[PDB]
From a paper:
Gas41 is a small protein of about 25 kDa with only one conserved protein module, the YEATS domain. The two complexes share a number of subunits, including Gas41 (Glioma-amplified sequence 41), a YEATS domain-containing protein. Here we show that the Gas41 YEATS domain is a histone acetylation reader. In summary, our findings support a model in which Gas41 recognizes histone H3K27 and H3K14 acetylation and facilitates the SRCAP complex-dependent deposition of H2A.Z, which in turn helps to maintain bivalent domains in a transcriptionally poised state in mESCs.
To decipher the molecular mechanism underlying H3K27ac readout by the Gas41 YEATS domain, we determined the crystal structure of Gas41 YEATS (aa 15–159) bound to a histone H315-39K27ac peptide at 2.1 Å. Strikingly, an N-terminal extended loop produced by the tag cleavage contributed to the crystal packing by parallel ‘β strand-loop’ (β8-extended loop) formation with the adjacent asymmetric unit. In the structure of the complex, the Gas41 YEATS domain adopts an immunoglobin β-sandwich fold consisting of eight antiparallel β strands and three α helices connected by loop regions. The H3 binding surface of the Gas41 YEATS domain is electrostatically negatively charged, facilitating binding to the basic H3 peptide. In the Gas41 YEATS-H3K27ac complex, the highly-conserved residues H71, S73, Y74 of loop 4 (L4), as well as W93 and F96 of loop 6 (L6) of Gas41 generate a serine-lined aromatic cage for acetyllysine (Kac) recognition. In addition, flanking residues of histone H3K27 also contribute to the site-specific readout by Gas41 YEATS. H3S28 participates in direct and water-mediated hydrogen bonds with Gas41 E95; and H3R26 forms a charge-stabilized interaction with E97. In respect of the hydrogen bond networks between the H3 and Gas41 YEATS, additional hydrophobic contacts introduced by hydrocarbon chain extension (H71, G92, F96, F121) of Gas41 further stabilize the interaction.
Residue numbers in the entry:
A (entry chain E): 22 to 31
B (entry chain A): 19 to 157
C (entry chain B): 18 to 123, 132 to 157
D (entry chain C): 19 to 156
E (entry chain D): 0 to 34, 41 to 156
Write the structure that this text describes.
Amino acid sequence: TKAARKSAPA
Amino acid sequence: VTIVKPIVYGNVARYFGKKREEDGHTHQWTVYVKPYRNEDMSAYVKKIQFKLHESYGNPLRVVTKPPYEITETGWGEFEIIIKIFFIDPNERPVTLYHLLKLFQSDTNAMLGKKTVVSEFYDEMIFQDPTAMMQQLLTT
Amino acid sequence: GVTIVKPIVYGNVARYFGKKREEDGHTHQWTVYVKPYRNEDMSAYVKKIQFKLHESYGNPLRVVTKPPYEITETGWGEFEIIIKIFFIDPNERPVTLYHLLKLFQSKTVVSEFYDEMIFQDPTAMMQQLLTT
Amino acid sequence: VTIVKPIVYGNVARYFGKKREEDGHTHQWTVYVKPYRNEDMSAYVKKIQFKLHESYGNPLRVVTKPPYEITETGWGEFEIIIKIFFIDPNERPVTLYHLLKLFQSDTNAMLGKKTVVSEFYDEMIFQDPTAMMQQLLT
Amino acid sequence: MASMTGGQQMGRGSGRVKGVTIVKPIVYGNVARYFDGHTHQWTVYVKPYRNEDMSAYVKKIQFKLHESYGNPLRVVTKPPYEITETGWGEFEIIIKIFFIDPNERPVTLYHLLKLFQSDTNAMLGKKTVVSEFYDEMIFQDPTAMMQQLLT
């Protein structure tokens, strides 16, 4: 609800 | 009675050329807030907080004097929350949202561009500022 | 009764291998793309962009749903690419662009054009997404 | 002692008028080697190989009897390697290079020419040919 | 044809504006790269933090190099405000910024030239050394002239 995502390449 | 302060904010990033062995970090980046033209924001800005991803140690980075920049290394893109606090404690903080851009597009890579830039324009609007604030905003 | 105009740039870049590749006879790497003229996040009002490649490619209808809106391939010949831009509001009709893929110069080859997405009398939803 | 055989080589091509839906081909083309004069080369030519672009199936095409022509459809221009082999193994093969031409020049288009033709000249020179070859050349 | 140019008020003061302070952020420092027998090429520079024309209010910038350099006093009068040299060692460069208004005292900056890469940057794809600092030129109670040139 209050915490977002972190994404790597490809 | 109404004062407008234009800014730009966002980040630059540069690729290592390789995954770093120790941490697997691949990019260096700097997230920032700047005045639109060459001037001093610090007269009326108390501090700017850059809230980084949970994977960073001490993710709430606070900058209390210019330049309002945070430089890090990493491997991933994530949203940074930017909160600008003013000298007048009663003037509400401004919150900005920025998606950190690290990975260059194939197009810009083929064009030989060396850095990634993702920058946006905004305006801090001060309506009916306290007399102190009006002085600080107009020096 | 309003009209909103969104400037874009689209086209391709290409680089010569220096010789024909032995396995498939390809000579170039290229990237076809669409981008805003100035920085903005187009995904606020763009759903997806389809790039229709030549029939000689596998899965010739290539689709990109998030930026950057680009497709990278190798090839040996020039052909027309059909670019179709879909919007978040299904009531806004898609935009179709045509691009002649350039491999040969008229360094790297660049063939890029300025264009405008014109939204006349946009739905209330679309007008908000266009003005974020 | 020295026998000269003039030849012409290259290709013709015709535009469909539109991209064909099924494979995106736009042109029909024929690549060829022909004697300049109306005569038969097969007495001394063993075979002529036409190496097409890798995008064609069995790109190494071989013709062992006249006419020495390969007809295909396509959409792009590419280099063809043409290799002419002789009946006498002592005569070394002749290798020619040809850019398959599909697109008419603007000059020829304005002149109203129907089809594209890209044709080049060569001379097969047999100097002091073996008695066998000399027999075959005559 | 006929037309005006611009109306300026007469009888105005040209002394110092006693209640204003104008701030001009700058960046300064050097870049350096490892290749007579010199081992590094380097460039020392000054730039505005946000791009603007500093030449509107800056007259010249002096870079005082080490004594071992010929003509150690380098002067740049238009952008880019940079001096490029070769050398072998790190030393302090004195930077003096002179203004268009002759009454305004020069600004002095001190910069230790960095030539040698740090190891963290070493493992990375960094091939150039960068040592850059932020500062602010403060004009408190600027002359009326400087206030116009600065704005």
